[PDB]
Amino acid sequence: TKVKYPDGFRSWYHVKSMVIQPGHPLENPVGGIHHVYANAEAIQGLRGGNYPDGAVLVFDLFDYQEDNHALVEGKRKLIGVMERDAKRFSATGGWGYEGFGEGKPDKRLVTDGGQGCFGCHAAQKESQYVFSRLRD
Template sequence: MKKQLIGIMAIAVTLGFFSTGITWSKENKVGYPEGYRDWTHVKAMVIQPGHPLYGSFGGIHHIYANDSALKAMKDGVSYPDGAVLIFDLLEAKTDNNAIVEGDRKVLGVMVKDSTKFKDTGGWGFEGFKGDSRERVVTDPKTMCFSCHEPQKHADYVFSTYRQ
């Protein structure tokens, strides 16, 4: 009975990772989020010249949430392990008096795993350059978490769900 329970738990954990669309490497790095565009789009924003974060994050922001993250966001509770949020940052271009999407600048990923990412509030952070799988986060604690840390009251997340 004990072996069956352990086997069932191992299958559940494996399926949980596959359902998030995240693949884990041996180093417990955050993987590229396959299929995230099919998740719920929860927010859009444009950071324009003059904003204090324009140099780093100027452009069009799209935020996506997997099912676990969406439920927590809607319920206003802490995010459970397995929650994934995507920050899709695109160039903002103007065309015919409209702001339109340009090339992708970075695809940011936050994955909640309170055991693996204890030093960063239970969140794993990664950024992928443009449309590539090239990792751009060399130190998640200083490059990502230091900015998210003031959001502790919201489980380190900036975005909220708009009804």
């Protein structure tokens, strides 16, 4: 029913990163430096296996500061969380979608059962609703 807060996600595998800057269509609300993390189960899916129930992907979003031709990580703005449960999250393609303001377990953001999240991630049906690609 609810997505679990992914405790210890900072110790997980770093999948990839990207920076979204002002002018980007998604500056509101995912402007900043983001890092994608995967637990062991999510790595199975990312490698081209299937995602086991209990796979978790985290979108970790930082604000950044301009420091002399460097973008420096500032405060955490939020995390997004995808948790795999084929049965419990069947209404949103087997992934539960949640946001935590500032990465705080007490600041749950999603109000529509993740239908908005799923609406965009649906475009990625062929890669099991995951945008991020495992890179070397």
